[PDB]
A paper describes a structure:
The misfolding of immunoglobulin light chains (LCs), which are constituents of natural antibodies, gives rise to the disease. In this study, we used electron cryo microscopy (cryo-EM) to determine the molecular structure of an amyloid fibril underlying the pathology in an AL patient with severe cardiac amyloidosis. The fibril protein is not glycosylated and encompasses mainly the variable light (VL) domain, which is typical for λ-AL amyloidosis. Although free LCs or LC oligomers can make pathological contributions to systemic AL amyloidosis, cardiac pathology arises largely from massive amyloid fibril deposits that impair the natural ability of the heart to pump and to contract.
Cryo-EM imaging of the extracted fibrils at 300 kV allowed us to reconstruct the dominant fibril morphology at 3.3 Å resolution based on the 0.143 Fourier-shell correlation (FSC) criterion. The fibril consists of a single protein stack, termed here protofilament. It contains parallel cross-β sheets with intramolecular backbone hydrogen bonds. The fibril cross-section is asymmetrical, therefore a C1 symmetry was assumed during reconstruction. The fibril helix is left-hand twisted as confirmed by map-inversion and shows a pitch of ~300 nm as well as a polar topology. The three-dimensional (3D) cryo-EM map was fitted with a continuous polypeptide segment, corresponding to residues Gly15–Thr105 of the AL fibril protein. The protein N-terminal and C-terminal ends are juxtaposed in the structure and form a protruding stalk. The remaining part of the protein roughly outlines the shape of a ram head. Head region and stalk lie on either side of an intramolecular disulfide bond that is formed between residues Cys22 and Cys89 (see below). Therefore, misfolding induces a 180° rotational switch of one segment relative to the other around the disulfide bond, placing the stalk on one side of the disulfide bond and the head region on the other. There are three major internal cavities and the protein is packed inside-out or outside-in.
Residue numbers in the entry:
A (entry chain B), B (entry chain C), C (entry chain D), D (entry chain E), E (entry chain F), F (entry chain G), ...: 15 to 105
Write the structure that this text describes.
């Protein structure tokens, strides 16, 4: 008689009285990007993979006022076996 | 008699009294992008994969005021086996 | 007698008294993109895959005021087996 | 006697008193895109696939005021087997 | 005696007192797109597939004021077997 | 004695007191598209497929004021078997 | 004695007191499209298919004020078998 | 009779009375990026991988006012086996 209880909560999860007050006044933004020559050549060859930001990836992130970037991948299992029983009887 | 209880909550989940007040006043934005030559060549060859942002991918993210980017992939299992029983009787 | 209870909630899920007040006043936006030469060649060859943003993909995301981009893929299972029983009797 | 209860809620799901007040005043937007030469060649060859944004796909997303892009794929199962029983009796 | 209860709710589902107040005043939009040469060649060859945005597809999404794009594919099952019983008796 | 109850709700489903107030005042839109040469060649050859936006398809979506695009495909099953019983008696 | 109850609701379904107030004042729209040469060649050859937007299809969607495009395909089953019983007695 | 209880909470999880008051007044931002020649060549070849920010990836992150970037990958298991029993009886 096995029991497994995985209550793996996520992103802004089971929230009681949450509040996110934001404000932004008077921003002036002029984020430009200019390139004369930029050649990345990122050729990723994985075999077995499970990770979050997999990218062998030469980026260029110019941020002005706001740029929120996350990645969720919850409760994962590449190879899980939570309970087991084996018996042998081969005469 | 096995029991499994996976209450893996997600994104803004089971929320009681949530509130997101936002404001943005007076923004002035001029985000331009110019390229003379930029040739990425990202040729990703995976075999077994489970991860969130898989991309071997040379990007260029110029952000003005706001750019929200997430990725959800919940409660996943590449290979899960939660309960088991085996018996052998081959005479 | 097995029991499985997967209440894997999703996106803005089971919400009690949720509210998203937004505002945006006075934005001025001129996001242009210009390219003289940009040839990505992303030829992804996966075999077994389960992940969220699969794309080996050299993008260029210029964001003005707002650009929200997510991806949901919930409660997934590449190979799951939640309960089992085996018996052998081959004489 | 097995029991399975998968109440995997989705997008804006089971909502009590939800509200999304929005506003946008005074935007001025001129998002143009110009290309002299841009030839992506993304020829993706998968075999077994289950993920959300599958596209090996070099895009160019210029965003003005607003561009919301999600993708839902809920409660999925590449290969699931929730309960089982086996018996053998071959004399 | 098996029981299966999959109440997998969808998009704006089972909603109590939902409201989406929107407003947009004073927008001025001039989103043009011009191309001298852009030849994607995306020839995707999958074999077994179940995912949401399948497209190996180099797009160009210039967004003015608003462009909402989602994709729903709910409660799916590539190969599911929720309950079972087997017995053997071959003398 | 098996029981299956799949109340998989859909799009704007079972709604109590739903309301979508919209407004849009003063928009001026001039979204043009011009092409000197753009030849996609997307020849997708799938074998077994179940996903939502199947298209290996290099598009160009210029959006002015509003363009809403979704896709619903609910409660699907590539191969589902919800309950079963087998017995053997071949003497 | 099996029971199956699939109340899979659809699009704007079982609605209590629904309302969609819309307004649009002062739009001026001039969305033109011009092509010097654009030859897609999308020749899709599927074998077994069940998905929503099947089209390997390089489109060009210029949107002015409004263009709503969805696709419904509800409660589907590529191969479903909800209940069963088998017995063997071949002497 | 085994018991496993993994209540591995996530991001802003199980929150009682959370609040995030923000403010930002008077910012003036002009973050530009210019390149005469910058060619990264990051070609990552992993074999077995499970980590969070996998990218062998020479980036250039110029930040103006705000740029929040995280990555979540929760409760993972490259190879886990939580409980077991083995017996041998082969005469």
């Amino acid at each position: 008689g096995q029991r497994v209880t995985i209550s793996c909560s996520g992103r802004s999860s089971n929230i009681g009285r949450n509040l996110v007050k934001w404000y932004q006044q008077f921003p002036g933004t002029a984020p430009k990007l200019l390139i004369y020559s930029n050649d990345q050549r990122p050729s990723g060859v994985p075999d077995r993979f499970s990770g979050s930001k997999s990218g062998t990836s030469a980026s260029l992130a110019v941020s002005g006022l706001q740029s929120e970037d996350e990645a969720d991948y919850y409760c994962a299992a590449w190879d899980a076996t939570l309970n087991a029983w084996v018996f042998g009887g081969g005469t």
